[PDB]
Write a protein that binds this ligand. Sequence first.
Ligand SMILES: NC(=O)c1ccc[n+]([C@@H]2O[C@H](COP(=O)([O-])OP(=O)(O)OC[C@H]3O[C@@H](n4cnc5c(N)ncnc54)[C@H](OP(=O)(O)O)[C@@H]3O)[C@@H](O)[C@H]2O)c1
Ligand SMILES: O=C(/C=C/c1ccc(O)c(O)c1)OCCc1ccccc1
Length: 318
Amino acid sequence: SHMATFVELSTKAKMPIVGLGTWKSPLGKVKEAVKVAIDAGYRHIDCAYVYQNEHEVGEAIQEKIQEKAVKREDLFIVSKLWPTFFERPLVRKAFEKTLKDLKLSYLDVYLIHWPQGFKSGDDLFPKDDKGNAIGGKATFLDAWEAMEELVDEGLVKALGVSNFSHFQIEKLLNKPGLKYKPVTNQVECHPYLTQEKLIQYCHSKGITVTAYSPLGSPDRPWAKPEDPSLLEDPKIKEIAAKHKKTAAQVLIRFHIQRNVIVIPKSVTPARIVENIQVFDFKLSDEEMATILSFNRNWRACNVLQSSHLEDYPFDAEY
Ligand SMILES: NC(=O)c1ccc[n+]([C@@H]2O[C@H](COP(=O)([O-])OP(=O)(O)OC[C@H]3O[C@@H](n4cnc5c(N)ncnc54)[C@H](OP(=O)(O)O)[C@@H]3O)[C@@H](O)[C@H]2O)c1
Ligand SMILES: O=C(/C=C/c1ccc(O)c(O)c1)OCCc1ccccc1
C-alpha cells in the first residue's frame, strides 16, 4: 500500500527514507508491530542489540518472508554494535548474536551505537560506585576494523555510525588503512534539535543522516513533566491542521524534506500506518523555516552522562 522514497547511499544501495524504530517496543508487542509495518509497506527496520527485543523482530521478519509478503532483498535492516563489545572478538560475537536473533544471513547496515568504549563484560551499563560510566580499552576505531571484516565476508552490506560529532567522523575518515566509509550517521533530530551544522557536514562528505527520536521520544523512561513536548506543541499542531495531518506526520515529513532519513517508533498499528502516510503532502518553504526556528539545542536522549570519558560526542558544537 505505501512505499517510502529511497535515499541513495555512497555504496549505491537504496535506504528507505522512513523506517520503523524499535527501542522500548516491549516483548510480546514488537513482533506484531513489525508485521503491521511490513504489511503497510515499511521496508526499513531500525534495531539494536541493546534494545533486547531483536529475536522477536526476527520472528516477524522471518514470518513475512515465509508468507512471500516480502523478499529479503527489498527489506532494509539496520542494527548497531553496543560499546561494551568494542574488542575485536566481541565485535564478532555481538554481531553474531544480533544476526542470529534477527534470523538473517546479512545486515544492510551495521552501526557503531555510541563512540565511547565501555567496560567489556556482563553488564550493558557498567558503572562505578557513583553510577558514572566505566570506560573500556578498545576504541571505536578498533571496532570499525573488526566491522570492516564483516563487509569483506559478505555479512554486512554497509557500515555507519551513531551519535558521532563531525570531529569523530573526521577521525574515522582520516584513519590510516580505512577500507569502508560510514554510509550514515544516526543522531537525535527534530525541531528542538535541528542539527544544521552536523547535517551540512555529513552531506558534504556523502554521509546520510538518520533522525532518531523524531517525535521527542515521549516514552523515554527519564522523561520529566517540565521537559518540552513536540507532539503537544501548538504551532506544530496548527501546521498539521492546515494539511489535515497529525502533529506526528508533520514531525516526520520535516526530516523527509531535508533529505534526512527518519525512524519513528510505534507499537500501535494505527500509528504505524499513519507514520508512513507522509508522501501525499508538502510543507511550504515558510513552514519549514518556521519549524527550523524552533531549535533550542534540546536533547531528549542524553541519559549517558559519560562526559568524563574520552570521545564524549555532545561536548563538541557539532
Ligand atoms: N542511535 C541511537 O542512539 C538511538 C537512540 C534513540 C532511538 N533510536 C531509534 O529511533 C527510534 C525512534 O526514537 P524513539 O523510540 O526514542 O522515540 P520516537 O519515535 O520519537 O517516539 C516514540 C513514541 O511516540 C509514540 N508515537 C508514535 N507514533 C505516534 C503518532 N502518530 N501519534 C502519537 N504518538 C505516536 C509512540 O507510542 P506507541 O509506541 O505506544 O504508539 C512512542 O511512545 C527508536 O525506537 C530507535 O529505533 C536510536
Ligand atoms: O540506559 C542507558 C541508555 C539507553 C539507550 C537506549 C537506546 C539507545 O539507542 C541508546 O543510545 C541508549 O544508559 C544508562 C546509563 C549508562 C550507560 C552505560 C554505562 C553506564 C551508565
